[PDB]
Design a protein around this nucleic acid. Structure first.
Ligand SMILES: [Mg+2]
Ligand SMILES: [Mg+2]
Length: 113
RNA sequence: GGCUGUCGUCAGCUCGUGUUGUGAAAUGUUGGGUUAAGUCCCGCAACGAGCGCAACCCUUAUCCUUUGUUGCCAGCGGUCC
């Protein structure tokens, strides 16, 4: 099952009871995730993800925090998928129809940079 | 009506969209700095915009080009200086 070498799942008491099923944990006053449930989760996850992908679908990666920021400007910045590695501008998706023309500007700047 | 004084040349006053709240409303315009300034930077469920601040206007301080009378006299002669 564990095709995933090393990511035992941090965070100690600061937990969330909604996250009981996916837990086997209890070590050194901190939770351990679950082998036999992390792996099964690709099941519904990589299945649908690589299907909508086949149907030609935009992806968009999201990962703020300067601890994996350019680590998403990566093989996510390789395919027809996209990314957000910094500040998530509130409403860039629900208010897309406004934020869109902040892009139109970016374009005008790099189109003369 | 038009025009004017006043707070005050104070740094303020608002809207679109989005989002939050049953709602009046909120956010943006909190906050950390910074500035003469809602000035700017960072931040941030906000993203942007309008009036305002600033700039564009005039004048003042240095220089340059063009211009030389009614303005000017440095080097030239003459002197009723
Ligand atoms: Mg302004
Ligand atoms: Mg002005």
């Amino acid at each position: 099952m564990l095709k995933a070498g090393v990511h035992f799942g941090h965070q100690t008491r600061y937990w969330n009871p909604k996250m009981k099923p996916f837990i086997f944990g209890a070590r050194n006053k901190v939770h351990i995730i679950n082998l036999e449930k992390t792996v099964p989760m690709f099941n519904e996850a990589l299945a649908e993800l690589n299907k909508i992908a086949s149907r030609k679908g935009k992806i968009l990666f999201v990962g703020t925090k300067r601890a994996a920021s350019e680590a998403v400007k990566d093989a996510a910045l390789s395919c027809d998928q996209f990314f957000v590695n910094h500040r998530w501008l509130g409403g860039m998706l629900t208010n897309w129809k406004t934020v869109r023309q902040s892009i139109k500007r970016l374009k005008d700047l790099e189109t003369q940079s």
